[PDB]
Every structure is written in C-alpha cells, then in structure tokens.
Design a protein around this ligand. Structure first.
Ligand SMILES: Cc1cc2c(cc1C)N(C[C@H](O)[C@H](O)[C@H](O)COP(=O)(O)OP(=O)(O)OC[C@H]1O[C@@H](n3cnc4c(N)ncnc43)[C@H](O)[C@@H]1O)c1[nH]c(=O)[nH]c(=O)c1N2
Ligand SMILES: Cc1cc2c(cc1C)N(C[C@H](O)[C@H](O)[C@H](O)COP(=O)(O)OP(=O)(O)OC[C@H]1O[C@@H](n3cnc4c(N)ncnc43)[C@H](O)[C@@H]1O)c1[nH]c(=O)[nH]c(=O)c1N2
Ligand SMILES: O=C(O)C[C@@H]1Sc2nnc(-c3cccs3)n2N=C1c1ccc(Cl)cc1
Ligand SMILES: O=C(O)C[C@@H]1Sc2nnc(-c3cccs3)n2N=C1c1ccc(Cl)cc1
Lengths: 386, 386
C-alpha cells in the first residue's frame, strides 16, 4: 500500500491538510490535482512580456487576524508589508473607498466631522425603516440612504450578481457599515501582506515535503477506483465540486464565474493603484487590476514603460467555466442541504472528508481555508490516521 | 576624575552620544538637562483626563532608511506598524495629501490617469519657466501651477514662516513633487512606526545604564565651572544653543517655535485622522493633532466619548522659547559662520563638541540626529577620548 492519505485538490485547503499529515504525523500523502499547477486559484505566474506577476484566477490578497495561521503560513513564505487599498470609480471620479469620511466629503461636496457624518447617514437612511424593507434595495437604502445606495451599491450589485437588487431579498444585507473616520485600509486584520517571492513559490513550498507526492493534471474521478483499491485503508480529503462528487443527483449548484481580459499596455502606469472598482453600469467590467502595483518593492525589476492590466467580468458559470462564487438561490440552498446530508453519510461510511471552497459550496478566503483545514486536521484527521 | 565625558542635553543626539559611550566603550558619563525630563521635544506623557499619549512639544513620527539606526533604535524600544498619513483642509474639504491623483481628482473635479495628470500639471506650470522666477512663489508656480500653489502652498507657507513667499528667494525650492499615482503614504522611508509603550519609556531605556548618571533640572552654565574643575580632561558634548554658548556675542540666531493649545473634548473622534493641516489663511493654526489616532491599537484603553487635540501655531522664537526650526536669513547665516569658528576654536582648546539641532543651528529628524550623533561618536569622540 502506497499512501496513508489521499488529498483531492491542490488549493490552500488541500495543501494545508496534506502538509500537516506529512510533517506532523509522518504519514504519506498523495495530492491529486486536476490542473497543470498547484495552489488552485491562488496560483500566480509571470506575464511573459513584462515579467510582472499576475493572477489568471483572480487577484489574491493575504490577510488574517489569526496568529496560528499567520505563523503557520510564514513557515513557507515571507510577506511584504503591502497594505491593500481600493478606490471606487463613479461618474468619472475615483472615490476613496470603503465608505468613510473621505468618500463622504468627495460625494456630498464638503467635509463632515465623524459626528456630523453619523448624523448625515442617519438623516439619509431614515427614508426607510429596516423593519419595513421588503427587498435588498430597500434594506440597503434603509441603512445608508438612497444617494449612496444609488451611487455605489445598486449598479455594482447588478453587475456582480446579474440581478436587480429590487428583486433580491432584504435579508441578504444585515449591515452596510460606514467608517466614521478617514481609515481606508481595506482589511482590518492584524497581519497582511503579499508573498515576497510570489504565490506559486509559496504554494510549491507547502507541497515540497518528502512524504508528499503531487500528481498534477489528474482528475480524481478518472483514477479513484484504482487508488481506492490500492490504498483501501487511506482516508480521502476531497476539495472538489460537491455536487459533481455525487454525480449531480440533486441537481447543479449555481456559481458565478469571472472573465479576465488581460492587456499589456505601453505605459508604465495605467491607474496608479492596484485595484480600481467600477461602480457604474456604463462600464461592463467590475474592476481593473494593475499588477505591478501589488509589488511596489519590485519597481527596479519592472518595465519602465509597460504595465499589465486585467479587466474583470462577472457571469453565471456555465458548462466549462471555472466556478468561483456560490450564488445561493433558495434552490441552491435546498440543494446544498441534500448534498450536505449525502456528504455526512459518505464521511462516516467511507472516510471521505469534504473541505475547501468547492467541497462545501462556500467562498473561503485563503486564511479561512487554511484555518478550516487546520481544524479538520485536528478534530478528524489525527484520529482517522492514527 | 569621576566622569570621562559630560553630555549637555537629554534629547536624542545626547542620549545617543552618552549611551554609545557607556555601553560600548565603558566610560562613565554625566548628562545635564535644563528640563525636568529626558528626550527634549520627543518626550511624551499621558493626558490626565483621558490618559491618551500626547507630545506636549509637537507630534513625533519615527521613520528612517538607515538600518543601523533602525537596529540601534530597536535596542531600546519596539514600534507599531503605524504609517503616517496627512489630510489637507482647504475651503472646507479635506484633501488627500501629498499632491497626487487623489488631490488632483478632488481639486480639478474628475479623475485623471497618471499620464493625464502629468499633462495637466505640465500645462498649468507652463505659465512660468523654472530659471525665470524671481522668488519662491514664482518657483513654486513654475513647478505645479498657480491654482495648486495658491490653494495648498501659499498661505500655509506664509503661516509657518511669517513671510511673503514672493519675497523668499527662488533658490529655496528646487523640487516640488507631485505623485502621479494614489500612494498617500506620507513618508517613503523603509522603516516606520511609533514606540509601542510611548516615547517617554523609550527615552528612559536609552539613558538607563550603569555608566550613565543624569541630572535633570540642571543648567550647564550654572554648574559647568565646578564640573569642569573636578572632571577636567573629560570632553563635553554640547547640544544646547550654539549662540547662547558664546553669550549671543555675534547676535541671536533666528528660530521658529510652535505653540500648542490643548483641548480635551466630549467626543470620541474629533476629525477621524491623526493630523489635519489647515492650508487656508482664516485659520491661525497650521495643523490639528488628534492623538488617539497615533495609537489605534489602544482604542480599548482609550475613552470612547473623550479625545484630546492640539492646535499648532507658528511664531518667532524668543529667548526661552523652545527653538524648533532654523530660519536661515542672510543675517542668520553670517552670524552662523562666526559662531562656527568660535565653536571650532572652543572644541580644539576646551574639548567641547558642538552637536544636535541647537548646537549646529540645523533641523534634525529624530533619525538624522541619531545618525549624526553616531558619526560624531565614531569620527570625533572614541578617537579622542581613548
Ligand atoms: C477569483 C478569486 C479571487 C480570490 C479568491 C478566490 C477566487 C476564486 N480567494 C480564495 C482563495 O482562492 C482560496 O485559496 C480558496 O478559496 C481556498 O479554498 P480551496 O483550498 O478549496 O481552493 P481551491 O478552490 O483553489 O482548490 C480547488 C482545487 O481542487 C482542484 N480540483 C477540483 N476538482 C478536482 C478533481 N476532480 N480532481 C483533482 N483536482 C480537482 C481544483 O483544480 C483546484 O485546484 C481569495 N482568498 C483571499 O484570502 N484573498 C483574496 O484576495 C482572494 N481572492
Ligand atoms: C516641535 C518639534 C517637532 C518635531 C521635532 C522637533 C520639534 C522641536 N523633531 C526633532 C526631534 O525632536 C529632535 O531632533 C530630537 O529629539 C533630537 O534632536 P536634538 O537632541 O539634537 O535636539 P534636542 O532639543 O532634542 O536636544 C537638546 C536638549 O537639551 C536641552 N538643553 C538645552 N539647553 C540646555 C542647557 N543649557 N543645559 C542643559 N540642557 C539643555 C534641551 O531641553 C534640549 O531639548 C522630529 N523628529 C522626527 O523624526 N519626527 C517628527 O515628527 C519631529 N517632530
Ligand atoms: O472580492 C472578492 O474576492 C470577493 C467579493 S467580497 C465577498 N465576501 N463574501 C463574499 C461572498 C459570500 C458568498 C458568496 S460570495 N464575497 N463576494 C465577492 C464577490 C462576489 C461575487 C462576485 Cl461576482 C464577485 C465578487
Ligand atoms: O514636520 C516637521 O517636523 C517639520 C516640517 S517639514 C521639514 N523638513 N525639513 C524642514 C526644515 C529645514 C530647515 C528648516 S525647517 N522642515 N520644516 C518643517 C516646518 C518648518 C517650519 C514650521 Cl513653523 C513648521 C514645520
């Protein structure tokens, strides 16, 4: 028998689980990854012409307030001091973003003290009682007022979810916080940074252990009869699609996908910030990423008069698209439930554990996936591998 | 016989000289300090009614790109992650500051790309060519255009120096940088932070050594005859005013001083950011500091319906005002040249060394003082107090 553990999927969840087993329990791990590379969607690589590090599966920003995770993660990479900030384009003006005093002054046309702004938001949002809000539009209005909702929320939402917010259902927003200071640090986590040597290097490291064999370009469902037969004792951590695992017997869970239009441009700086949101309906893309700006420490390496940008587009994920964000319509929810029960059975009866973004039909930040894998390793995999 | 070195003044340049003396080459040192505390103007303390750390003699922000100084400095304290950011109040709008894409957008009314912005600034500063320009005012306009100059530079300059910019020489401004991106990190030094437990602590530990004894509330001139008698080959490091040493014999050197009106308010947040510049003439003060925002990691220990602010005012420094920034008028310089030969003759026949802001008539950042002190300690001191 070849392996004590089988991990399907090479994302942060899979990797963490495989790496812990390998180095903590001394067990032997096979990682079966369907793509040609490790790391799932966190994987990055050099754009050929500029050499700038880019993401083909979406921009990734590491941040966490979990010291265990931070310490763990720092075993495989150093991190830059990068602090993620975002701006929001509305009617040809780049707004300071997360809503706070900066956006408020730009928007309403004059400076508001912290107390004056609290009062402003209340006066604006009073048009509707949260109690009386019958949908998402009303709920949002009830929280931040119609002008801010109409300026920065409505269209942006329609683009991402391709639905009128008048038609989404009110419970979808519990809160829309306004910062009543000038703090525009996008994350409020203790630790934040980008991998000094790029993502690929970091993920590659997590998998570089003597007790780990990586199997790229290999669909689990194509080789699972063999592998199970040869390693009948070995449990399985599955981070693949949950509905696909059960042969879509309860239907197909709905995801949004993302399209990325990449351009190399003959300027050294296109927007002077890593990410520009586009809140208006008049521009089809949701954001533009300019990647050089993610690693300002590399400016000497970087082209002087070239930059790579990437326009992002939201779309329902169809036959052949990469699934990215779970949609969670009522049907999706009822469907998820049936699959969740089936999974419970499978785990008990089969020693097949489900994890990760796809495995659980749930969006996970990198640090939340890592935490969840540390938990599964602790509460389940040490016993199961004992 | 009792001391191998006397250091005058407990500001950073002195603490650096005395510590590098005691710790590294062993000698026993005396520090004489006019004032009732260590640190000079760096010294912080808690404000009674709120307990918030404040500087009674001006906000101090540590930042440097000298690793040696960074290292040295950490030997005595630890630093927060704090990054300094400034906002500029003009005609009732807080502006993103250092001039860059943000300010430009707020000011000119629409978003300019990095390239578009460079065009805009070129076109606006075309009005005066650089090697034209009689005065500083014209030089500025030559570099950034007249509208920006009048909004953000003119009155603010006039407030700090109490002079008409158009009767300052053009030479005073060489570069007037506008950032053609969205970076508003105020300093661009490699290392940056505030002392986790305040400056007061940090300063103590600089002193706190065995070969270091320090007399507070002690004027050098009131006691130097005795001390020089008993300890008569011990060279002196003088960091007091260069002109008061030689009894103002060649004139009084012109300095700026700052006054600080302190207010404790019935509100947890006055302006939502540490420092707001006031660029306009209708405001007597240059700057408002709200000190709770210097240390956000203590928002628990902080009150939640109180905060303390300081309005900063600029004035010509009287004798017995605390000198802050050298004015360098032509009379000032001519005076300075003769104070220098007086001081250099004094070093060479009295073994008194002249260092620090006050001893050299020269503004020094915290880290430029330490760097300076170290290089005196090397080149001048250890050589001649073998
Ligand atoms: C567009 C976009 C943007 C972001 C993010 C995600 C996405 C999609 N994330 C989340 C981040 O990618 C995170 O690492 C994952 O969500 C973690 O969950 P998984 O480990 O399951 O990753 P992930 O979903 O990447 O791993 C799944 C892997 O399993 C493989 N697989 C699927 N089926 C298989 C099969 N049958 N056989 C073999 N292999 C199979 C897949 O190929 C894939 O590599 C993020 N996080 C963050 O912290 N900050 C951020 O800014 C972002 N940004
Ligand atoms: C208002 C203001 C604001 C700032 C700053 C200064 C000032 C004045 N600085 C500069 C910094 O505070 C200062 O340079 C350092 O403390 C060290 O400089 P010196 O020790 O050389 O002068 P420093 O003044 O600190 O040292 C000399 C001290 O010796 C004492 N002394 C004078 N005469 C004496 C006598 N006859 N006998 C005994 N003792 C005597 C005085 O109390 C005097 O302060 C700063 N730096 C930075 O990096 N970031 C910042 O934000 C600021 N902000
Ligand atoms: O920017 C990001 O990386 C994620 C943002 S923010 C966020 N936080 N929680 C969630 C989700 C919960 C449940 C499903 S998605 N999101 N969704 C994002 C998002 C959603 C849909 C689309 Cl088309 C594009 C971005
Ligand atoms: O923020 C600070 O700590 C100082 C600023 S910025 C700066 N950098 N170098 C210098 C000087 C060189 C030479 C004389 S002063 N300055 N001056 C400042 C300043 C000057 C006058 C006034 Cl009333 C107030 C602040």
């Amino acid at each position: 028998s070849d392996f004590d553990l089988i991990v399907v999927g090479s994302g942060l969840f899979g990797l963490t689980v495989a790496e812990r087993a390998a180095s903590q329990l001394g067990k032997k791990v096979l990682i079966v990854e369907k793509r040609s590379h490790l790391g799932g969607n966190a994987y990055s690589e050099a754009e050929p012409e500029t050499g700038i590090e880019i993401h083909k599966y979406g921009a990734h920003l590491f941040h966490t307030s979990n010291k265990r995770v931070w310490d763990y993660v720092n075993q495989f990479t150093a991190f830059t001091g990068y602090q993620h900030r975002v701006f929001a384009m509305h009617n040809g003006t780049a707004y300071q973003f997360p809503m706070g005093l900066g956006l408020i002054n730009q928007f309403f046309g004059r400076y508001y003290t912290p107390d004056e702004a609290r009062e402003l938001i209340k006066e604006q949002s009073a048009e509707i009682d949260s109690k009386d809000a019958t949908n998402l539009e009303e709920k949002a209005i009830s929280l931040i007022g119609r002008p801010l909702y109409e300026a920065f929320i409505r269209d942006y939402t329609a683009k991402q979810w391709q639905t009128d917010p008048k038609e989404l259902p009110a419970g979808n927003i519990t809160r829309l916080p306004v910062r009543y200071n000038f703090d525009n640090r996008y994350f409020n986590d203790t630790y934040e940074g980008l991998p000094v040597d790029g993502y690929a290097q970091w993920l590659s490291n997590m998998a570089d252990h003597e007790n780990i064999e990586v199997r790229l370009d290999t669909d689990w469902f194509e080789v699972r009869e063999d592998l199970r037969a040869q390693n009948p004792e070995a449990p399985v951590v599955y981070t693949g699609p949950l509905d696909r695992y059960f042969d879509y017997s309860e239907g197909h869970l709905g995801w949004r996908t993302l399209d990325f239009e990449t351009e190399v441009l003959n300027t050294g700086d296109f927007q002077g910030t890593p990410v520009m949101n586009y809140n208006d309906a008049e521009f089809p893309y949701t954001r533009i990423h300019e990647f050089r700006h993610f690693h300002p420490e590399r400016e000497d390496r970087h082209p002087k008069d070239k930059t790579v940008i990437m326009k992002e587009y939201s779309r329902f994920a169809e036959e052949g698209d990469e699934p990215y964000y779970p949609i969670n319509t009522p049907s999706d929810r009822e469907m998820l439930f049936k699959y969740r029960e089936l999974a419970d059975a499978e785990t008990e009866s089969g020693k097949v554990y489900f994890g990760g973004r796809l495995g659980t039909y749930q969006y996970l930040d990198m640090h939340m996936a890592i935490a969840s894998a540390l938990s599964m390793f602790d509460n389940k995999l040490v016993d199961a591998l004992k």
